Amino acid sequence: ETHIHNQGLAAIEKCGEAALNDPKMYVQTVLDVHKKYNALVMSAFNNDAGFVAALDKACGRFINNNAVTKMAQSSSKSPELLARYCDSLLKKEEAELEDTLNQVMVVFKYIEDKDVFQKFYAKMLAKRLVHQNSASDDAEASMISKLKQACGFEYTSKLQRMFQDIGVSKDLNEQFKKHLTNSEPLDLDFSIQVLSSGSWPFQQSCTFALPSELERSYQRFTAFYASRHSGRKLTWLYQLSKGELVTNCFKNRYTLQASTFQMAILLQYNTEDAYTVQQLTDSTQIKMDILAQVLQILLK
C-alpha cells in the first residue's frame, strides 16, 4: 500500500502542473496507476482480500490529495476535474464510450467529495441539455443508471426528472406541431423549452424589455396559453436564448450560432455605425463586466 501510494503520487508529480486545466490526462494517470497495480494484485497476489483492500486504501488516499490538489489548495479540484472529464466525453462506437465511462466510475468510487462532483456534473448536464451539444442519449441514460447503482436514490431521480422534463417539452413541441398540421400554420415557427424551476439550477437575470417587433405575437401566444392552461405562467429567460443565422450574400453559405444579444446589437446598427459605451450604458443600463465579456467573446 505504501509503495503504490507513493507511486501514484510520483506519477502525478511527474505530470505536476499541466493537469490543472486538462482533466483527461490527469484521470488517465490515475487510471494507469490503478490498472497496473490491480493487475499486479490479481496475478501475483492471487486476488487476496487484504491486498485489494490495500490497493483501495492507497488509491483513495492519492486521488483526493495530490500535486494539483495541493497546488489549487482545494480537494474539490479532484472531483471537479473528473466532472469536466465526463463533460469532455459527452459533448458533440458505443462500446468504447461505455468502457470509458466504466473507467470513470472506477475512478469515481474513490471520490469522497461526491456532492461537489455531482453539483458540477448537474450544472454541466443542464448546460448540455438546454440547447445542443449532446452525444447519443443512450450514453447519458447509461451514465444516470450507473450513478443510480453507485450513489443513492434521490439525486439520480433529480437527474432523471430533468431528463423527463426535456422529454415532456419535446412532447409538447410535437403536440404543437401536430396542432399546426391540421390547421393554418403561422407566419413564423416558435419553439420553447418549458422546464421545471426546481429541477434546473438557473437563476433570474437582469430585467429586459421586449422590443416592439414581437409584442403582438407574444401577447397572442400568452392569451392562447391562458385559454388552454390559465394556471401556468412562463418565466422567460432571455439570457439563454439561441439563434441561427445564414449569410445569403456571399458565394459560399455559412452558418452562424448567436444569441438574441447579438441580433439586438446588429438591429441597433440600422441608424448609426459607431457606438459609444457611455450612450448605450445610459440608455439600457448594462453592467460593464457583462458587456466586457461579450466584447471579449466577439473578439476571440
Partner: peptide, 20 residues
C-alpha cells in the same frame, strides 16, 4: 444589402404554480 430576417426563435422558459 445588410438585410436580416427572422425565421426561427428558440427561447427558454420555466413553469411554476401560480397559487403562491
Amino acid at each position: 444589402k445588410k438585410r436580416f430576417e427572422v425565421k426561427k426563435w428558440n427561447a427558454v422558459a420555466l413553469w411554476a404554480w401560480d397559487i403562491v
